């Protein structure tokens with residue numbers, strides 16, 4: 001009926017590979033935080049490498065095609081993958097947190113802050129996630 | 133209908149600020165790439181600072197609570213926002229790309245693991261065909 005969200009895909013991946021994926025927000029061991037940092041740094045470096053390639057080709061006058069974007073698109077998705085992966089390993093529903101950030105960002109656009117603007121309250125999202 | 137995805141939320145956000153983005157994959161101006169790179173670097177640095185802070189509290193002997201994770205979770209979601217933001221400005225359906233990357237990541241399950249925990253690739257592993265995703269979206 002509906003495809004899984006990208007956040008739910010990360011849950012499937014971590015279960016498939018035996019990586020920690022708690023049901024509820026869970027303070028992690030330092031080894032997990034270190035790995036998440038390393039995976040983010042790896043993905044971030046590949047994105048930058050591909051952006052630099054495209055800028056260098058444009059500087060030389062190349063007319064980029066849609067297909068020329070595929071390496072960059074791949075690395076940007078890898079960066080999503082390990083960003084979702086950090087939230088999943090923390091036991092934090094990424095869609096619930098993203099929804100709150102989106103609420104605050106979109107509400108901010110509807111104003112310059114609008115009158116009763118409420119910034120993102122991720123602590124509240126964390127507390128509600130513990131109590132399902 | 134199916135609920136909106138986070139990539140669809142970015143498309144909604146870009147329209148709402150009056151900067152509607154392409155519906156199909158579209159090569160961007162160089163200015164667009166340099167701006168998206170800066171946003172990614174700043175969001176990445178915010179995340180790194182929060183991870184460093186949690187690691188420093190743990191190395192001090194402090195016990196983290198779930199509530200202590202909210203600043204990190206916030207900055208990770210901000211990073212999602214600017215990463216999805218980049219794909220949306222390129223006119224590239226993030227969910228289509230992500231689905232194919234996901235399929236190729238699930239096929240790594242039989243591979244070995246690195247000392248830090250990273251899942252590595254088994255022999256015979258084949259990468260995702262993101263060129264095929266872009267081609268499919270471009271014609272469609």
Ligand SMILES: O=c1ccn([C@H]2C[C@H](O)[C@@H](COP(=O)(O)O)O2)c(=O)[nH]1
Pocket residue numbers: 039042077078079081082085233237249250251252253
């Ligand atoms: O432990 C891991 C190992 C790999 N990946 C995903 C992130 C990227 O989508 C892609 C990067 O893998 P490498 O190409 O760096 O091996 O696999 C993870 O999420 N967790």
